[PDB]
Amino acid sequence: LALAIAITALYSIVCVVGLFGNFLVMYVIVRYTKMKTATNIYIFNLALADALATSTLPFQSVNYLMGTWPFGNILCKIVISIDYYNMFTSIFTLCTMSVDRYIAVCHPVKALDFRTPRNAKIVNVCNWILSSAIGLPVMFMATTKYRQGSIDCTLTFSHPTWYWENLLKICVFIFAFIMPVLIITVCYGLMILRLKSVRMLSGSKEKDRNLRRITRMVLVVVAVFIVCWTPIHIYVIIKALITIPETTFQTVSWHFCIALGYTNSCLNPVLYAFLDENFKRCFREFCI
Amino acid sequence: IAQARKLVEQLKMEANIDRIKVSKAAADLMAYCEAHAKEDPLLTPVPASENPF
């Protein structure tokens, strides 16, 4: 139906934008902004996590247009583990990039000892390792099931099915939305407070222009994260609580809210690389 | 003081030297390059098998 194509297209565009933006960021980092600074390592990790997250979208896009999962059991475990894995990896990279920018500004003396590129490599690997605390269990449980004459790639839980199914959703709610928002908001909020009292951003008209720019950037990253993830996270919680009748609006909003949580992977390249000051210099060299 | 006197003595030593013409100076430099032109890896790339890099 036209709506299904529209939903499929909305998932496609989010996929194409996400991959093209993230692969571009990784490309520029590999060749121009080497993975020397801690920031670039996080940017590359965020772009890689974002790219892997959005690589699952074509399979979900096909799994929606034709109403069945034609990619088999093995891929289902991969495409759901990559989804669940790259959500927590993408979120924890943002949480690390927030804490990295917070220690930089609020503990600058300690930041020198901790913000080494080596530590960025460790914390990045630790993000991927910890994100296996959900991706691996999801990989085991992400079995393909036959239902109503069509194949559905989903998660299979243990008895009681309610307990583990909601425990995953609750843990996805706490450690992928609540803990991130508190970290991202508190870290960047405390960051802006320090910046409000720093000599090179206060005491002049033009310096205030820079501070407004940094504050706008900080607000926009928090804002984009809240606008992208909150809709789907609450929608998942409401569905797990009460039965919402399936209508032409409930379906569209649901897929839109999923599309929006994947659009944070589409926007992470722009927010953290294309609007990075270091990248603008080196990106200006990019030939196309 | 004695700095000026040294300059004259230095200049006299620098003035009393046998100078050759720039055509024999230039010809010799040209001759050296032609003689060693073949054995100059940066001029004519040697075979890739012979290049240690």
């Binding site: 600074t37 920031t39 920018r101 500004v105 913000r115 000599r199 090179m200 990248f279 | -």
Partner: protein, 221 residues
């Protein structure tokens, strides 16, 4: 290929040492101590060959202060060596306003400080460098302006011959030398004998610079 393998292992081993030494050096604060002779460079060290390196730690932060007074050669050839220094500590003796350079009496040695400060502050190597300007000998300067007008050094000065206005005017004249004000900060402190205040000022100014650099590294600024 035991010999070849040992070479790579040796190369990896010193690669680790190079990284380890770089991290130890990356966290060190590098300060370039400048100023004309008798400007208070020696005393500021006490407050904390060719180049004299002074090491001090304050509030868990390690400082490396480099004195280049013994480098009487052309500064333009070696000044770029200190590009990337955290900050420049420029010492100016406030009492120099009433004095003249010994070699030449035409130029006021306070004016020499401004020309020196102007050269360094607007140097193309220090553009994004912050200058901890230390106005030294305030006590001696205060005891002079009571019987010697600041107009001897600044003809355009039209303020009271008191420490508050006179010292402030000298501070403004040095700060006005900074052409690119927006991209460069001048942290001016009137040096005091009380301990933990001159070094505290450097720490506060350097913390601001480190945060500023962190913003550059973080890509925010």
């Amino acid at each position: 290929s035991a010999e070849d393998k040992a070479a790579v292992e040796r190369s990896k081993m010193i690669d680790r040492n190079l990284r380890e030494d770089g991290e130890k050096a990356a966290r060190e604060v590098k300060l370039l101590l400048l100023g004309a002779g008798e400007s208070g460079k020696s005393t500021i060290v006490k407050q904390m060959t060719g180049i004299v390196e002074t090491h001090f730690t304050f509030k868990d932060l390690h400082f490396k202060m480099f004195d280049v007074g013994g480098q009487r050669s052309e500064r333009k050839k070696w000044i770029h060596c200190f590009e990337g220094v955290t900050a420049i500590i420029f010492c100016v003796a406030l009492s120099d306003y009433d004095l003249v350079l010994a070699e030449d009496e035409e130029m006021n040695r306070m004016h020499e400080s401004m020309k020196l400060f102007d050269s360094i502050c607007n140097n193309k190597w220090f553009t994004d460098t912050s200058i901890i300007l230390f106005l030294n000998k305030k006590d001696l300067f205060e005891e002079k302006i009571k019987k010697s007008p600041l107009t001897i050094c600044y003809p355009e000065y039209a303020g009271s011959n008191t420490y508050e206005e006179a010292a402030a005017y000298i501070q403004c004249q040095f700060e006005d030398l900074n052409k690119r004000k927006d991209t460069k900060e001048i942290y001016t402190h009137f040096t005091c004998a009380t301990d933990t205040k001159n070094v505290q000022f450097v720490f506060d100014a350097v913390t601001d610079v480190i945060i500023k650099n962190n913003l550059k590294d973080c890509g925010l600024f």
